[PDB]
Amino acid sequence: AVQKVVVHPLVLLSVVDHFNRIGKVGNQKRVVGVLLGSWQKKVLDVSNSFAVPFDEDDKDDSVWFLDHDYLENMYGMFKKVNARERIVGWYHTGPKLHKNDIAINELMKRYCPNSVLVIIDVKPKDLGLPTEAYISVEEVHDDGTPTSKTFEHVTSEIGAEEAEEVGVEHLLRDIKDTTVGTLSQRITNQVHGLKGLNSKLLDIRSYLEKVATGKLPINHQIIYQLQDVFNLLPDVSLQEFVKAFYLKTNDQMVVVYLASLIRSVVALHNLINNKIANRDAEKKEG
């Protein structure tokens, strides 16, 4: 129902500053807040946020609190300063998907129908994009419970904007491997993209940890896809897939042979424009 989410770097920074101002508790606190923004043309947008007071005792961890008076008036202010801005859902700091986040969402779905959550990172280390979001779906279905409900991850990325790209590219000043030539693709997707497929291959190995020893639910709806991946694994090298491969190598490299041939004569002409300024300059000036 929802294509994708769009997260701006403002709200990305507008959690971590709050994680620092509650980082003095030391023991345990998760940053849970209210996510503001719109969604237009079937694309979920994220613009603004704040954080709501929240505590959690370890024994009987089903007692949460959202001070809704703090939720009412501060959104009442933000609607007043920006009528275009509205609620879009909520978020939590999400180290490892805590347990209250099955009914935090159902507590505050009376404001947003598709009340989406956002899992963020507080310790940044990965080879990907450490911003997670799910969606709420329920089922009167197959085997688990008469009342069953499990979150499903919708794809997530950091969307840009013209006004913030001034500030985003100003605050970096560290490294930015621009000048896209023959080697930007070599590193953004040929060094890294092959190692992109590393952790996707390694992820199904982590599910494979249950061969006879792991957790008790076994498969039912996980293996129809895995049966297809080995089935839709690509065509072997016997057909004219051999021959049509050498066909295009004998076509694509022709253009490379022509273009490289051109590059020599161009720089050869530039050598002549430098001998016109050497021999015709020593006799004149000295």
Added chain:
Amino acid sequence: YLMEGSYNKVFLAKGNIPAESYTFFIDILLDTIRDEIAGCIEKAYEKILFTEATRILFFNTPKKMTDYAKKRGWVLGPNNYYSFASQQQKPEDTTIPSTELAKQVIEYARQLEMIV
């Protein structure tokens, strides 16, 4: 005459040794031709009876042909040299370019963008 394929005119010169004996030399030249024809029996030949390629070296019919026919193939049968002319196993190799050309395409980009 050993450079080109000529073999008979080689042994016409083994009918013509004028100067001295030259015996130990042409016998090594026998031996390095014996494995050569036992090498070049392995071309694309059909059924040959036990007379035609039996006389291509010198020999009439000793058991020396069984020494060659059990060293290599062309199996002893009912007056037959069996041809295992397969030459089928090696082609359809995309991987050998796909390892080597992936090396070469990177080598194109080395002397293309980075200053040397």
Added chain:
Amino acid sequence: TRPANHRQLTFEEIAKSAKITVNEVELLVMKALSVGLVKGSIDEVDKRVHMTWVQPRVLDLQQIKGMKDRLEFWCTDVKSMEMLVEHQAHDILT
């Protein structure tokens, strides 16, 4: 049952494995294509069929052993080809 190398069965084998005559197995497979449980093509003069997609079934803790092991040496093949990348294109980008 057949591997992904061929999975190319003939009509005579269907006439063996289902003991049904030749003039009905073409009617049998067009029903199978129409319902959608299999997706392949049909030759008639060489009397073979190129089955490509089959319906996914269920399996016990023994078929995951095949899917563990066919996956496992495919891991290092991603390691091996990318090993050429960061070692040959190393000076292109630090």
